[PDB]
Amino acid sequence: HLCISGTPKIRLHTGLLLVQLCGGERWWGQFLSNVLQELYNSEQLLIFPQDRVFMLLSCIGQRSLSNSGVLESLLNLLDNLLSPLQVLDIPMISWVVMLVSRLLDYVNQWSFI
Amino acid sequence: IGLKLIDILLRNCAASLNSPLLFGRLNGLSSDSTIDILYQLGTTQDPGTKDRIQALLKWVSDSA
Amino acid sequence: TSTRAIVNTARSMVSTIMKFLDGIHNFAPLGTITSSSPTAQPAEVL
């Protein structure tokens, strides 16, 4: 309700508020992946600032990256999205990989990226 | 191949380590180009015209 | 076959996302210049 459609300050504070409260819960990583799935899958028609919301999600994951479930669930989404190789949703994969890439590098030859 | 092309533009554009894959594109995406192609296929007068229209309507019903 | 054998280097939504996260460009000013000769004058002015 708030982070997708809210104002930047409301968006930022809601995201930061959600991290501080529920960032340490086991289901937190699943929530991030579910949000990622629901909001960025190519079947989503909802119009919203994907880039601004994505920056928030990257920020949110970084501030909750101490929760082992964050990266676990994010890679499970990437695992499931790539299952067709082993139909692929390339835009969804791009969002997930970039989120996963930014989160992992927070966890020199790649400094060019 | 008109039916195959309709399937590619509307239903499934994926290929039928050396085999072509073309996994990179979402199915059914539209542009001015796809719209023009579909319109010319539909409104082109030939023996297959009927069949092509049939395919189109089929995809409509399937979607619904 | 060739379409199979090539990957598109044109920029895509990943490059757009990187841009959202903030003709050629001189990177010398950003670099550090050194020399193997101990007696060389420091060349940062270059």
Partner: peptide, 20 residues
């Protein structure tokens, strides 16, 4: 790290599957 292998294997397949 079995799921890690799975995603990495699928990532390589994706790498190997990348075309135009």
């Amino acid at each position: 790290h079995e799921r890690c292998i799975s995603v990495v294997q699928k990532l390589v397949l994706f790498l190997l599957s990348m075309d135009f």
